[PDB]
Amino acid sequence: SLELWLNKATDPSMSEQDWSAIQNFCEQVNTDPNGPTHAPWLLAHKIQSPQEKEALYALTVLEMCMNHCGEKFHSEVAKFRFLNELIKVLSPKYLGSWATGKVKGRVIEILFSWTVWFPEDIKIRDAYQMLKKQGIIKQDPKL
């Protein structure tokens, strides 16, 4: 099941991330019909974790699934509702986020990469720009 793999793939007790589980997760996402509509929220929660390793791992899982899953999953992540969850990590408000700067940087990196690899995704473009406008993302990262 999705949960199963995701938790193996994001386990913070692991000195290293179980790469095989990550692959297993993104495959279930195409497999199970719930996958597209449930996986993003499962991911979103872990990315917002106060446990940094759990967050990073998840960011990596997210990164891998966007690249390997099909149009359905892609479609869900490309929606604003989901992007807004990603963006909460970048909250500039006092105690607005318990995410480390490492995590925030990663989110920022992942977002720009998307604006570049998927120019067809409007909400994604608009969000990155919005962040840019709000001063939350000073300047574009690498790739």
Swiss-Prot record:
Residues 9-139 form the VHS domain. It is found in: Golgi apparatus, trans-Golgi network membrane; Endosome membrane; Early endosome membrane. Coiled coil: none annotated. Its main location: Golgi. GO terms for cellular component: clathrin-coated vesicle; early endosome membrane; endosome membrane; Golgi apparatus; trans-Golgi network. Ubiquitinated. GO terms for molecular function: phosphatidylinositol binding; small GTPase binding; ubiquitin binding. Plays a role in protein sorting and trafficking between the trans-Golgi network (TGN) and endosomes. Mediates the ARF-dependent recruitment of clathrin to the TGN and binds ubiquitinated proteins and membrane cargo molecules with a cytosolic acidic cluster-dileucine (DXXLL) motif. Mediates export of the GPCR receptor ADRA2B to the cell surface. Regulates retrograde transport of phosphorylated form of BACE1 from endosomes to the trans-Golgi network. Monomer. Interacts with NECAP1, TSG101, UBC and AFTPH/aftiphilin. Interacts with CNST. Interacts with GGA1 and GGA3. Binds to clathrin and activated ARFs, such as ARF1, ARF5 and ARF6. Binds RABEP1 and RABGEF1. Interacts with the type-I membrane proteins LRP3, M6PR/CD-MPR, IGF2R/CI-MPR and BACE1. Interacts (via N-terminal VHS domain) with SORL1/sorLA and SORT1 (via C-terminal cytosolic domain). Binds the accessory proteins CCDC91, P200, SYNRG, EPN4 and NECAP2. Interacts with ADRA2B. The VHS domain functions as a recognition module for sorting signals composed of an acidic cluster followed by two leucines (DXXLL motif). The GAT domain is responsible for interaction with ARF-GTP, UBC and RABEP1. Required for recruitment to the TGN it prevents ARF-GTP hydrolysis. This is ADP-ribosylation factor-binding protein GGA2. It comes from Homo sapiens. The gene is GGA2.
